[PDB]
Design a protein around this ligand. Sequence first.
Ligand SMILES: O=C1N=CCc2c(O)cccc21
Ligand SMILES: [Zn+2]
Length: 199
Amino acid sequence: DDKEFQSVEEEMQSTVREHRDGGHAGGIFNRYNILKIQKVCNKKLWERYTHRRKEVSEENHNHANERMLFHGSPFVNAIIHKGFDERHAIGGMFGAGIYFAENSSKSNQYVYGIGGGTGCPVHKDRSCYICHRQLLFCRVTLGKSFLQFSAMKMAHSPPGHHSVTGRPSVNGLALAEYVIYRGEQAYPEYLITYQIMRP
Ligand SMILES: O=C1N=CCc2c(O)cccc21
Ligand SMILES: [Zn+2]
């Protein structure tokens, strides 16, 4: 458990980047105080995930193209019990999808809502150093992933594809993002409780 969770902690800290908004959405910090890392064991969600992963693999030259990615949401507790649900997803960069990041600090910008919302419920602060936040570190099946640079408002995956990869560009994205259009293509494997730390 210790080495498995240290690997999660390393992924969480090492993928932090300096954000263009100067910390507006997610707060100002260089690292986190990781409080707890819990493995989510939801058999029904796991099987919904693996059934779809097998299907996608068969449609993508025997390859699921699975990645471990972060997800930030004010609804992590509904996600761990009921799973990711595309019915809760159009106005986003790549449309009506479920978004993930390979940089934990990008997902951190979504923990209190879009653009950070009004921050924590207690102090109404997007840069709250006191209130404990939660992120998910997820197993995500990308399958055949459609590489895109500019905004493309999809309702579903592009024809013949299983996801969209938003790649960084001068005029566009600062960091990558990964988008699925079917909730069963992600499993909320780790629940991370943490605080952002004052630099
Ligand atoms: O973790 C996320 N949660 C919601 C939206 C989002 C994005 O729109 C891009 C990358 C990551 C996330
Ligand atoms: Zn607070």
